[PDB]
Amino acid sequence: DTAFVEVVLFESSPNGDYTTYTTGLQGRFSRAGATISAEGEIVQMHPLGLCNEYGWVGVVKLEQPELDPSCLTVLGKAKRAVQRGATAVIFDVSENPDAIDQLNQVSEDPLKRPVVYVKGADAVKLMNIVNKQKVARARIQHR
């Protein structure tokens, strides 16, 4: 059930030195996807792109439905990311609890990549890194 996510942020200096920062956070593998390990560069998926290269980890921050005018269901968003070559997708479900119920419905034919959700302090930590818009990678593991 539990998904352990390691996030690494890369920052380069003009002189060519680089720094990294790694932190850990926890989520859950949803039944909509696989419970396997995955790792890749983080790409945030915003609404316009969802409604319009490979191995990236997609991050989707769900908003309240009234503020998240969408073309897709939460499942449909996961499917689209996997279609477009994501190795995994992580939903921040902080502002939309119901998405958890939708992702956990027993699928006859679940996605073959992990579909993880985070919330609370773990989601805050993730989004604080994602919003910096630098190079960052996520590793997802089940223990």
Author numbering: 31 to 82, 91 to 181
Question: What do the authors say?
Answer:
Rspo (R-spondin, also roof plate-specific spondin) proteins are evolutionarily conserved from fish to humans and have well-documented roles in a broad range of developmental and physiological processes resulting from enhancement of canonical and non-canonical Wnt signalling. ZNRF3/RNF43 specifically targets these Wnt receptors for ubiquitination and turnover, hence reducing Wnt signalling responses. Direct extracellular interaction with Rspo proteins inhibits ZNRF3/RNF43 activity.
By using a combination of heavy atom and molecular-replacement-based phasing strategies, we determined multiple crystal structures for Xenopus (x) Rspo2Fu1–Fu2 (highest resolution 2.2 Å), xZNRF3ecto, zebrafish (z) ZNRF3ecto and mouse (m) ZNRF3ecto, (highest resolutions 2.4, 1.6 and 2.0 Å, respectively), plus complexes comprising xZNRF3ecto–xRspo2Fu1–Fu2, mZNRF3ecto–mRspo2Fu1–Fu2, mZNRF3ecto–xRspo2Fu1–Fu2 and xRNF4F3ecto–xRspo2Fu1–Fu2 (at 2.1, 2.8, 2.4 and 2.7 Å, respectively). The ZNRF3ecto crystal structures revealed a distinctive variant of the protease-associated domain topology. Two β-sheets (comprising β2, β1, β7, β3 and β4, β5, β6 strands, respectively) splay apart, accommodating an α-helix (αC) at the open edge; two additional α-helices (αA and αB) pack against the β4, β5 and β6 face of this distorted β-sandwich. A disulphide bridge, conserved across species, links two structurally elaborate loops, β3–β4 and β4–αA. The resultant single-domain structure is relatively compact. The crystal structures for apo xZNRF3ecto, zZNRF3ecto and mZNRF3ecto showed no major differences in the main chain conformation. Comparisons of ZNRF3ecto structures for proteins crystallized in several different crystal lattices, or for crystals containing multiple copies in the asymmetric unit, consistently highlighted an acidic region (N105-E114; residue numbering is for mouse sequences unless otherwise stated) within the β3–β4 loop, the short αC–β7 loop and the extended β1–β2 hairpin as flexible elements of the fold. Our crystallographic data provided independent structures for multiple copies of the ZNRF3 ectodomain in eight different crystal forms. All but two of these crystal structures reveal an extensive interface (average interface area 992±109 Å2) formed between two ZNRF3ecto polypeptide chains.
